[PDB]
Design a protein around this ligand. Structure first.
Ligand SMILES: O=C(O)CCC(=O)Nc1cc2ccccc2cn1
Ligand SMILES: [Mn+2]
Length: 225
């Protein structure tokens, strides 16, 4: 839970040592209240104008279906997503300044942003691993936007189950909080049921080597003969 600061200072004095020791790192006050609020306004606008999906099918008469986390993929260049793009550029700055110091990984790319909205209907996200099968993602980066979140009332804690340790790491989805954690089986995790609207923005960073050999395993095409 570091206190945010120049991307370099954050990276060098906190993110790198913490990731190498624990594999889970939390930075509070990452962008500040004004920018964080602008991001919140953008995400809420996406929600209000219908850009999210209807939500993960949780319970399947279709009228009674229960849906959970809603998502939209954001590049950061869309009209009205400018400050999300600024967040993504800031995440990228941090990771660049971590180059070669995050384990033995060499990060050379990332996904688009996955913006998630838990609608507050008691749904969460079941325990899972982000990259269980070697798809190239080495670091999960999540930015939370929920002002005055109170988990005692609203739920929505991200619980991580660090491998080989008999303990939970419970992360409240607090406003302006940035979370990094290794994407692989070291960090299974779940979202506890959320009883208020809960937003988060996720990017995953690729390790060059794992991603290069995933491409071979994945095999999307192909050159014609
Ligand atoms: O919001 C948070 O605290 C993170 C919750 C979480 O793990 N979300 C998540 C959402 C995903 C959506 C599509 C594919 C993989 C996914 C992996 N993880
Ligand atoms: Mn996940």
């Amino acid at each position: 839970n570091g206190q945010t600061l120049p991307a370099l200072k954050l990276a060098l004095e906190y993110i790198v040592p913490c990731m190498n020791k624990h594999g889970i790192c939390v930075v509070d006050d990452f962008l500040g209240k004004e920018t964080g609020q602008q991001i919140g306004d953008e995400v809420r606008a996406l929600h209000d104008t219908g850009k999210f999906t209807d939500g993960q099918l949780v319970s399947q008469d279709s009228s009674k279906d229960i849906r959970g986390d809603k998502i939209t993929w954001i590049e950061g260049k869309e009209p009205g997503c400018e400050t999300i793009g600024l967040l993504m550029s800031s995440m990228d700055d941090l990771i660049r300044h971590c180059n070669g110091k995050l384990g033995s990984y060499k990060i050379n790319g990332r996904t688009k942003a996955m913006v998630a909205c838990y609608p507050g209907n008691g749904t969460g996200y079941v325990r899972h691993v982000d990259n269980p099968n070697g798809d190239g993602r080495c670091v999960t980066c999540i930015y939370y936007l929920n002002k005055d979140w109170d988990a005692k009332v609203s739920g929505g804690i991200l619980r991580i189950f660090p491998e080989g340790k008999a303990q939970f790491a419970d992360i409240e989805p607090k406003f302006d909080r940035l979370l990094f954690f290794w994407s692989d089986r070291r960090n299974p995790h779940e979202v506890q049921p959320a009883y208020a609207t809960r937003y988060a923005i996720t990017v995953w960073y690729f390790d060059a080597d794992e991603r290069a050999r995933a491409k071979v395993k994945y095999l999307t095409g192909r050159v014609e003969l």
